[PDB]
Design a protein around this ligand. Structure first.
Ligand SMILES: CCCCCCCCCCCC
Ligand SMILES: CCCCCCCCCCCC
Ligand SMILES: CCCCCCCCCCCC
Ligand SMILES: CCCCCCCCCCCC
Ligand SMILES: CCCCCCCCCCCC
Lengths: 130, 130
């Protein structure tokens, strides 16, 4: 019917990607709710959620490049290098983010609990992203 | 021509996606970055340039080339996509510089950061232009 083979494959790949993204976003929402109503505030949870959403969007764009080389290849070649350079410079940022996520998950101390962290004692106000 | 059904469908889909995104944003502000409508425009422009390249190939294999070597359209579309990407990156740099300036920072540091980012983008352009 004058239909070039490949349209069905494109549709199925797009649908699979959409389902994967929806599941990832549901997981992000569950994680954000757990962080919020466990020990964390709202601003940090929202920031973490939107960071995860941006990361998923970036991974989608990177994987979507298998269709056209003039749509994402002309931009992915720079985005990947910039992200790698930032991660190399920002390694401490990711380390702090992971440590904060662990502190929210495992609760050695809660807000309003007098603690001593390496010679610096005082009441804990809130655990933020970094 | 009716033969380019795939190109017609892709262009119509890109246009419909842009229109729907505009309608959604009018009813409610888009989440994450405001750059969502800029990324949507970038992707639609990439799709349009791919369709234009396909139609040029069809014309060259069907219609007279008018002594035009195939590739000029591809070069033009790639250059236009790069220009749009650079404009969006520069707008993001300007937003970041304004935020740094009128948040806690002075003007000299903000200007230096902005021009450093501009130089980095120019370098990435030169590297990709090779
Ligand atoms: C409201 C806070 C917005 C921050 C969203 C995440 C930004 C990630 C930038 C990554 C640069 C390497
Ligand atoms: C209940 C167990 C949850 C464990 C999931 C951890 C997810 C870490 C998110 C990392 C964000 C960059
Ligand atoms: C009190 C709930 C504890 C949940 C901890 C789950 C273990 C996460 C392992 C992460 C490995 C990177
Ligand atoms: C007025 C300050 C000009 C500095 C502009 C950035 C220079 C970057 C040089 C990078 C060398 C590796
Ligand atoms: C509101 C969130 C803004 C986050 C963007 C960070 C950009 C870092 C610039 C790095 C310059 C080399």
């Amino acid at each position: 019917k004058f239909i070039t083979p490949g349209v069905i494959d494109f549709i199925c790949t797009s649908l699979i990607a959409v389902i994967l993204t929806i599941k990832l976003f549901l997981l992000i929402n569950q994680f954000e709710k757990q962080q919020a109503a466990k020990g964390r505030d709202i601003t940090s949870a929202r920031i973490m959620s939107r960071i995860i959403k941006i990361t998923i969007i970036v991974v989608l764009v990177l994987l979507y490049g298998e269709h056209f080389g003039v749509q994402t290849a002309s931009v992915i070649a720079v985005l990947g290098a910039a992200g790698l350079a930032v991660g190399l410079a920002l390694q401490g940022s990711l380390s702090n983010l992971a440590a904060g996520v662990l502190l929210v998950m495992f609760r050695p101390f809660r807000a309003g609990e007098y603690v001593d962290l390496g010679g610096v004692a005082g009441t804990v106000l809130s655990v933020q992203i970094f | 021509f009716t033969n380019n059904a795939l190109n017609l469908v892709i262009i119509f889909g890109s246009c419909a996606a842009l229109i729907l995104m505009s309608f959604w944003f009018r009813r409610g502000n888009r989440k994450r970055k405001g750059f969502l409508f800029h990324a949507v425009q970038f992707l639609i422009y990439t799709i349009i340039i791919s369709a234009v390249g396909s139609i040029i190939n069809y014309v060259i294999e069907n219609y007279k080339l008018k002594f035009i070597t195939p590739g000029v359209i591809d070069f033009i579309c790639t250059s236009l996509i790069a220009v749009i990407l650079t404009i969006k990156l520069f707008l993001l740099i300007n937003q970041f510089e304004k935020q740094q300036a009128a948040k806690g920072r002075d003007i000299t540091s903000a200007r230096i950061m902005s021009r450093i980012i501009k130089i980095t983008i120019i370098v990435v352009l030169v590297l990709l232009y090779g």
